[PDB]
Each structure stands twice: as structure tokens, then as C-alpha cells.
């Protein structure tokens, strides 16, 4: 479960990294940063896609990607962090 969601998130982020570095001309690390803050809905206070292609892709990327990204964040903290902490509270 967590593994599959992990891989799916990675692929999704790889896709965004490639798209933004190519179409919007961002440095790979910046493309990844934008993909990440966009899908987690944090957003970026400085960059907004400048091309129409970038805008359309971002719209679609958002609708398809948020569900997944949060599904992963959900399991990451519940099935991977909840116990590691919950078990530690055990005297």
C-alpha cells in the first residue's frame, strides 16, 4: 500500500519535473519544487506558469495529482508514523 502510493507519487512528481523544466524552462530542482508545492496545495508565492501549455497542464496535473499525493501523505503519517510514535508512548 504505502509502497505503491510511494511509487505512484514519485512517478507523478517525475512527470511534473520533466514538464516544467521543458515547457516552462525551470531548473529541474525548481520544476520538482513547483510540482510538490502545487500538488500539496501549499502553492508557490513567486512562480506561476507563463505559457498557456503550462497553465492547462497545471490545471489537469492538479485535479489528477492532489488525490494521490494526499492519499500518500495520509498513509505515510498513519501507517508509518502513527505507530513509530504510538508504540513509543508505551511505558
Amino acid at each position: 500500500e504505502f509502497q505503491v502510493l510511494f511509487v505512484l507519487t514519485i512517478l507523478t512528481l517525475i512527470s511534473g519535473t520533466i514538464f516544467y523544466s521543458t515547457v516552462e524552462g525551470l531548473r529541474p530542482i525548481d520544476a520538482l519544487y513547483f510540482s510538490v508545492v502545487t500538488l500539496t496545495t501549499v502553492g508557490d508565492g513567486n512562480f506561476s506558469p507563463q505559457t498557456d501549455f503550462g497553465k492547462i497542464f497545471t490545471i489537469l496535473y492538479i485535479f489528477i495529482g492532489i488525490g494521490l499525493v494526499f492519499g500518500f501523505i495520509h498513509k505515510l503519517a498513519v501507517n508509518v508514523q502513527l505507530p513509530s510514535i504510538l508504540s513509543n508512548l508505551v511505558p
Copy 2:
């Protein structure tokens, strides 16, 4: 269900596209982009409505639109992407 939520989201976004392109003078594609990042709470790092009408509308648009948009994103990934992936994990 997914169909109704799909149509409802489209209508909501069409409404925003028309409003922002008319009152805030945004190019239609930019009006749609702003409507989308606003309702998914991603936000835009460059544009904020400049008119009081735009500000009041955005406030109302947000309260009425987020519930719907996330209800659609929820079903989109759960009733349309969960299986297409879950079924594929089947050896």
C-alpha cells in the same frame, strides 16, 4: 455521481472564468487558471483580485466552491483511479 460532480465542477469553473475575465480583465485561460488554483486552495503567487467586486466574489466563490471541487477530486481518485490501479495490482 462522478458525472454529476464533474458537470457541477465544470459549471462552477465556467462561472469563475467568465467573472474574472470580465471584472478583473483576465485572459480567459488565466481566469480559468485562477479559478482552479483558488478552489483547490493551491492559490496563485502572482495574481490577487484588484477590484472590490473581485475580492467579494472570490470570498463567496471560495466558500461555495471548495466543498464541491474537493468532493469531485475525492470521487475522481477513489471511484475512478483507485480501482484502475487497485485492479492492476492483481497478479
Copy 3:
């Protein structure tokens, strides 16, 4: 329920409107806009509190206000919009 959450949200937003217009010197409508996008996590791409008082308040305002605001948005679409639409789907 919806009424109480409605009033609670109004009071919370009134509080923010007063704070930002006074401490950060924003026009009342802008103070309200910032309070709204902040609590719904949409965020504003142009304004960030400039005073330390504004920053500390925003931090506290966020932790105390998001839970409420989303509790209201949740009931607004589920107990006030779900039926008005769900009932309409009835042939």
C-alpha cells in the same frame, strides 16, 4: 449546527478584519480578503504580514481558525448543498 458554525465563522472573520486593518493597515475589505484566503489555506500571492505582531497573530489565527472554517465549509456543502442538488436529481 450550520447556523452556529455560520456565526462562529463570521466572528472569526470579523476578528481578522479588525486586526489586519488596524495592525497591518489594510483597507477593511482587504483585511477580510486576507483573513478568508488565509483560513481556507488558499493564501494570497501578494500580501504577507509586515509586522511581527501581524506574523504572530497570523500563526495563531491559522491554528485556531482553519478547523472551524473547514467544519463550516464541510456542513455548508453537505447539509445545505448536497440535498438541494441530490433532491433535484430525483426524476
Copy 4:
């Protein structure tokens, strides 16, 4: 529960405050503000990490921190504010 989540959130925010004030050179209060709006997904409309180290950390900070921060906000309003209000509605 609320106590543990409280402490965990504090530690997480302390970590961000230290990181951003050191690597991105932000005033401690600004580092804390950025950590807070980032983890609650509100985002900041003016600042984005400028160093690659800052970008990578923010990406990881987000994935590890949102789950926790919202788990705390969830219990804060449900197990600490819901009653204080719900009980008051009692004639």
C-alpha cells in the same frame, strides 16, 4: 493525545525555524512564519526558498509535516474546541 500532538508540532516547527533562519538566512520569526504557512498549506505569497538545500528540505519538510500539523489542528478543534462550544449551546 492533544498534548503529544502539541509537542510534536512544536518540535517540527522549531526544526523549521532553525533550518530557515540558518540556511535561508531568515529572521527567526520569519522562519517560523514560513514553516507554519508551509505546513498548513496556506503558503507565503512573497518568500520561496532561494537555495537548493532550502528547496529539498522544504519538499521533505512538507511530506513529513502536513500529516502531523493537520492531525493536531483536527484534535485541537474537535477535542478542545468542539466541547467548549458544544457544551455552551446547552441551555
